Amino acid sequence: VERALEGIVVCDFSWVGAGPIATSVLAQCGADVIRIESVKRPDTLRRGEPFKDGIGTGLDRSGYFAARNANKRDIALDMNHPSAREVAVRLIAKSDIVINNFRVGQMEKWKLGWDEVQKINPRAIYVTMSMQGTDGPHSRYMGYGVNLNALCGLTARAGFAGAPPFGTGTNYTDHVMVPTHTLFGIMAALLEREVTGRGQTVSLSQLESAISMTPSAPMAFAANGEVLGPQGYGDAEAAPHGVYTTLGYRKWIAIAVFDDAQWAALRRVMGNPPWAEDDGFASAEMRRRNAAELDERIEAWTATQYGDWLMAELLKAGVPAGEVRDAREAIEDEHLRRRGFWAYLDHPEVGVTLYNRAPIVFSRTPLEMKTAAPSIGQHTREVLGGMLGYSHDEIENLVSHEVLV
């Protein structure tokens, strides 16, 4: 077993969203991710649904928290304790990456800004994530993923024309846009450190990471002076392109046609009904012009079909199609399971439950899923005595003073 980040150590202050999912990826690559979580301020997700069997007792039953924290170690350091900084310094001295997603200024309250980390460990990569920058009129503002969806322009362009916008239905910004840019910045600094022997700071604006993956709204306005509106489930080029009812409860199929060859294949799957042979649907331009009627006619037909059988037929004919799956269908999907995306891990409290690896299949250094999410302070003594070199007596003293739990 070869691991891409073998030997890497992460001092992980990050919590809630974005930060934790990023360090989860590092841990799947073999990095020793040491999460600092105090009993004084437990990760808010530990108290968030869903819980095993809907029983939200204690702090170790939430799948919201758990899914973001597989394969991590956890030390319960109360960073506001006067004696805590000395423990954190020992860890930073052994860490390749120091990361946090607190509000701006928090690390400096603990005298753990870059200036001090660079002196503790000139090889450390000091990673900070702010909502929208360390400085500026809005730098003290706060928000969750759904807030950044709105501020970055995504939500306005995620909805039906003429209706209230909807967004993604999730805290999307935190799940992919922010952690991926964070991870890339980390890796860039690690690659550079291989040559320079020095760490450096990596600072991300979550707002700017999100806009960087939704460029059309600002670019279209900056270039043409008009706001690019939402388009529901339609497309600007593909035709037909939409979401259509099939048989069953809240059952839809997505169908997307990009050229005349795919339109001919869709017509054949439909049984070549006379209506689809009309000159009003013969070219991509006409199918766009007549999209409303086209969608109505397609839905009249898809509503008589089983969506899985129809999807299989369309894909076999070269037409992009996909059943609109709920989460159970994703969990039970032959494809994701054969790919090994889903992973079940045992947990002393909740038993065997569902996790997933990050979406990368390495041919030589594959991701690994080894341990369920930790409890607060699960590895306090192990880390203090093993990595940080505290004597047995010093650990007992630290615990008596409640520096750690």
Binding site: L151, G153, V176, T180, L191, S203
Partner: protein
């Protein structure tokens, strides 16, 4: 200060793929966008620069392939495949979004491409992956979103879902493919051995189910989108648009009282209805009555006021409020202005300035940059092949047989 200039990245991508290589270009890597003689399909989708519909007018093409040079090679031609192999001989990273099996079937498997370049990383970006039951079959942004579980969350109750903008199925795969590429590149520097990096849209989007999978695994519940839990990731109309609100989450109690403070301070009629502990429990917020009079009380007030007012007054009272920004708001955003985010660069092919999103991160030593204007088709074919050791005569003959395409 340093940069990525020592890394050469071949980027054979179209509508799917190109943001990954842009991330490398943004830190200074030598990135070469590889097109077919028929041209990158991203050149043919909008939105557009003005009324132009030509090969250089796609705003997306300009954005995702800034910072790259451009060549054109026909891999269906044996001499094109020979040149491609010479290119790969000197590359650190190949990123590509080809249909699964195509390169293998052309005799261009990873083992061939790396035979004389053991460190080579090959990253494949595809709808469903290089392997598995769906790998033989076509996918698009919409259908990957459907099959991953992501699309279904963009609605409530029996409503059909809406799409995310800017092909997020593609963008999610590309962002994770950039990460996977960089991880494999780091591993290769240390081990001397590259590998294949397989990133599928369907998997990248399953990363964005939030907690929907855990809701099924742990509670046997099918969830759809947020938007109907009173005061928790809800959207509300105002005088000139919409705002997004997170005034309470989970069973974490600080957040609600400040929201009531705000409503009282503003004299919102019926504010007192909100000063009640019935609002602290996830089952009540999601109840019919909990949600409806939350919106009656709040939206009677928000509907009289502007997005900027609520952003200001909300964050002033410490409530996590943000505006639903449109493109105009984004360009006027004073925080982004303070940060110098918007990048403007004159484009000589268009004869105009183009404004782009800017850096998503900052580094202590490295420098982010937009880089050169996106290439014209085959703009750099000649110099890139000359850089690989091809004579001027060999290039002419490659053009003559149709193995490559150089611009004129």
């Amino acid at each position: 200060g340093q940069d990525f200039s020592r890394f050469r990245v071949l980027d054979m991508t179209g509508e799917l793929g190109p943001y990954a290589a842009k991330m490398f270009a943004g830190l200074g890597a030598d990135v070469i966008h590889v097109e077919s003689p028929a041209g990158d399909p991203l050149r043919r989708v909008g939105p557009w620069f003005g009324d132009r519909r030509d090969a250089q007018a796609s705003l997306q093409y300009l954005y995702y392939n800034a910072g790259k040079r451009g060549i054109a090679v026909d891999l269906e031609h044996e001499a094109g495949r020979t040149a491609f192999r010479r290119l790969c001989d000197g590359a650190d990273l190949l990123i590509e979004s080809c249909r699964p099996g195509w390169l293998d079937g052309l005799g261009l498997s990873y083992e061939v491409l790396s035979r004389d370049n053991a460190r080579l990383v090959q990253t494949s970006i595809t709808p469903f992956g290089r392997t598995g039951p769906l790998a033989p079959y076509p996918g698009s942004d919409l259908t990957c979103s459907a099959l991953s579980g992501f699309l279904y969350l963009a609605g409530v109750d029996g409503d059909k879902p809406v799409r995310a903008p800017d092909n997020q199925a593609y963008r999610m795969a590309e962002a994770y493919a950039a990460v996977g590429s960089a991880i494999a590149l780091f591993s290769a520097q240390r081990s001397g051995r590259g590998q294949v990096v397989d990133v599928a849209c369907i998997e990248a989007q399953a990363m964005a189910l939030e907690n929907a999978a855990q809701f099924w695994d742990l509670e046997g519940k099918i969830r759809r989108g947020r938007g109907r839990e009173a005061g928790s990731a809800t959207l509300h109309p105002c005088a000139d648009g919409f705002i997004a609100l997170v005034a309470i989450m989970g069973r974490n109690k600080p957040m609600w009282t400040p929201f009531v403070r705000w409503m009282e301070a503003e004299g919102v009629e019926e504010w007192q209805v909100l000063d009640d502990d019935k609002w602290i429990d996830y089952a009540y917020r999601t109840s019919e009555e909990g949600y409806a009079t939350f919106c009656r009380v709040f939206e009677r007030y928000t509907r009289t006021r502007s997005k900027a007012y609520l952003y200001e007054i909300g964050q002033r009272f410490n409530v996590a409020v943000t505006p639903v920004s449109d493109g105009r708001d984004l360009l006027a955003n004073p925080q982004l202005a303070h940060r110098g985010f918007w990048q403007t660069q004159f484009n000589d092919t268009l004869g105009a300035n183009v404004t782009y999103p800017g850096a998503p991160y900052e580094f202590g030593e490295m420098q982010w940059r937009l880089g050169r204007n996106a290439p014209r088709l085959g703009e750099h074919t000649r110099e890139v092949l000359a850089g690989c050791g091809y004579s001027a005569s060999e290039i002419d003959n490659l053009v003559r047989e149709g193995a490559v395409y150089a611009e004129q």
